[PDB]
UniProtKB/Swiss-Prot annotation, chain A:
It is found in: Secreted; Cell surface. This is Complement C1q subcomponent subunit A. O-linked glycans are assumed to be the Glc-Gal disaccharides typically found as secondary modifications of hydroxylated lysines in collagen-like domains. Keywords: Collagen, Complement pathway, Disulfide bond, Glycoprotein, Host-virus interaction, Hydroxylation, Immunity, Innate immunity, Repeat, Secreted, Signal.
Curated annotation (Swiss-Prot), chain B:
The chain holds residues 117 to 245 of 245 of the full protein. Core component of the complement C1 complex, a multiprotein complex that initiates the classical pathway of the complement system, a cascade of proteins that leads to phagocytosis and breakdown of pathogens and signaling that strengthens the adaptive immune system. It is found in: Secreted; Cell surface. Coiled coil: none annotated. Core component of the complement C1 complex, a calcium-dependent complex composed of 1 molecule of the C1Q subcomplex, 2 molecules of C1R and 2 molecules of C1S. The C1Q subcomplex is composed 18 subunits: 3 chains of C1QA, C1QB, and C1QC trimerize to form 6 collagen-like triple helices connected to six globular ligand-recognition modules (C1q domain). This is Complement C1q subcomponent subunit C. Disulfide bonds join 63-77. Its main location: secreted. GO terms for biological process: complement activation, classical pathway; immune response; innate immune response; negative regulation of granulocyte differentiation; negative regulation of macrophage differentiation; synapse pruning. It is linked to C1q deficiency 3: An autosomal recessive disorder caused by impaired activation of the complement classical pathway. It generally leads to severe immune complex disease characterized by recurrent skin lesions, chronic infections, an increased risk of systemic lupus erythematosus, and glomerulonephritis.
UniProtKB/Swiss-Prot annotation, chain C:
This is Complement C1q subcomponent subunit B. It is found in: Secreted; Cell surface. The chain holds residues 119 to 250 of 253 of the full protein. Ca(2+) binds at residues 81-82, 88. Residues 1-132 form the C1q domain. The C1q domain is the ligand-recognition domain, which specifically recognizes and binds the Fc regions of IgG or IgM immunoglobulins. The collagen-like domain interacts with C1R and C1S proenzymes. The C1Q subcomplex is inhibited by sulfated molecules, such as triterpenoid sulfates, heparan sulfate, or chondroitin sulfates. Core component of the complement C1 complex, a calcium-dependent complex composed of 1 molecule of the C1Q subcomplex, 2 molecules of C1R and 2 molecules of C1S. The C1Q subcomplex is composed 18 subunits: 3 chains of C1QA, C1QB, and C1QC trimerize to form 6 collagen-like triple helices connected to six globular ligand-recognition modules (C1q domain). It comes from the Eukaryota. GO terms for biological process: complement activation; complement activation, classical pathway; innate immune response; synapse pruning.
Length: 133, 129, 132
């Protein structure tokens, strides 16, 4: 029986590109999430919940993006632009109906993409199947 | 279906009226049509335990209230001046057939996100009964 | 059929001390009664995958530790969200695989500005995704 569900956090992330990589896995049931690339891969078609809570100190815009057949499918954005140098958690989430092979990831805005790096607090990216289709 | 899911979004640059129900006019997914965009309300077809969560972008003060069947369940307020933040809330509720769930604002009503910051409401059936 | 889910708010009007378990005393939902409103801890009966989440209203700086464990609790993550002379709402979340007897709760820190009242709620929720 399918039990795809993951949570991954940031600690020693490989930097570069607009994809936010959550390098440190906390949970990865059925291993749908790739900690090297920051991508979730759909094996079981169905409806999934995806959500993030990401720590910034300056400006951050984030989007949950997906692909089907390699075609990028841009979506909703969520921003914190307080820009005072103090911890702010930006959050977002949505249900995604996914087909087999579909990929899901978090992208930052290139002009607004400060993510806290350090040990004081955490940024998290999670997802789970709601039901198969 | 014997399931229930929705993610609806608010696609407009004018914020809600003060002390009013928040309409989410745009659908990302809503296969059972449980959320109604013309009324702004979710209505339960399939009874059981539901998770409800929203993420709301705002550039001024914002309180979001979740209502179940005429009753305020939870309120979450974020205060901001000019710059953009995200107001978040959520709750697990065991619902009977025909029960209504919706979000509202009070005197703090701003949902004008900057370019690239959006507002989303989601709900899903977890345990049918 | 194991239907396990809980949502509880904090209405207790008492400041938090460092390393104190954050109690959410008012239960909205508690199917299977695996959450204890007296302590603020969820205790696993049915092993498997759970999603845990919370939203905290605050008036200044807040850091919370999400804790797991049977006999000795250890922190999984810490969530910090700061506010300077303003009101905020923040959130954290985690998918956890749980063994029987393990508890999950939120733990206060140095930064303990947390509101629990009508018009500014702090809620703690969790639910079973899949059993083992």
């Amino acid at each position: 029986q399918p039990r795809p569900a993951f949570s991954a956090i940031r600690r020693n992330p490989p930097m570069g590109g607009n994809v936010v990589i959550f390098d440190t896995v906390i949970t990865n049931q059925e291993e749908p999430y790739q900690n090297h690339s920051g991508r979730f891969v759909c094996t079981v078609p169905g409806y999934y919940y995806f959500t993030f809570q990401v720590l910034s100190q300056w400006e951050i815009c984030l989007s949950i993006v997906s692909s089907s057949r390699g075609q990028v499918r841009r979506s909703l954005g969520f921003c914190d632009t307080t820009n005072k140098g103090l911890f702010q958690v930006v959050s977002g989430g949505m249900v995604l109906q996914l087909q087999q092979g579909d990929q899901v990831w978090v992208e930052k805005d290139p002009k607004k993409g400060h993510i806290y790096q350090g040990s004081e607090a955490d940024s998290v990216f999670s997802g789970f199947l709601i039901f198969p289709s | 279906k014997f399931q229930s899911v929705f993610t609806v979004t608010r696609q407009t640059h004018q914020p809600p009226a003060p002390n009013s129900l928040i309409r989410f006019n745009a659908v990302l997914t809503n296969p059972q049509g449980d959320y109604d965009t013309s009324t702004g309300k979710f209505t339960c077809k399939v009874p059981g335990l539901y998770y409800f969560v929203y993420h709301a972008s705002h550039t001024a003060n914002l309180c979001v209230l979740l209502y179940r069947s005429g009753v305020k369940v939870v309120t979450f307020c974020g205060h901001t001046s000019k710059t953009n933040q995200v107001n978040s809330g959520g709750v697990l509720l065991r619902l009977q057939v025909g029960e209504e769930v919706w979000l509202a604002v009070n005197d703090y009503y701003d949902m004008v996100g900057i370019q690239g910051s959006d507002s989303v409401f989601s709900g899903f059936l977890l345990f049918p009964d | 059929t194991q239907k396990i889910a809980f949502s509880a708010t904090r209405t207790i009007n008492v400041p938090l001390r460092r390393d104190q378990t954050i109690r959410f005393d008012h239960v909205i939902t508690n199917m299977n009664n695996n959450y204890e409103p007296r302590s603020g801890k969820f205790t696993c009966k049915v092993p498997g995958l759970y999603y845990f989440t919370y939203h905290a209203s605050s008036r200044g700086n807040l850091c919370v530790n999400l804790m797991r464990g049977r006999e000795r609790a250890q922190k999984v993550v810490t969530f910090c969200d700061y506010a300077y002379n303003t009101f905020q709402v923040t959130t954290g979340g985690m998918v956890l695989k749980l063994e029987q007897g393990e508890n999950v709760f939120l733990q206060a820190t140095d930064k303990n500005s947390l509101l629990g009242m009508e018009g500014a709620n702090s809620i703690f929720s969790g639910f079973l995704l899949f059993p083992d």
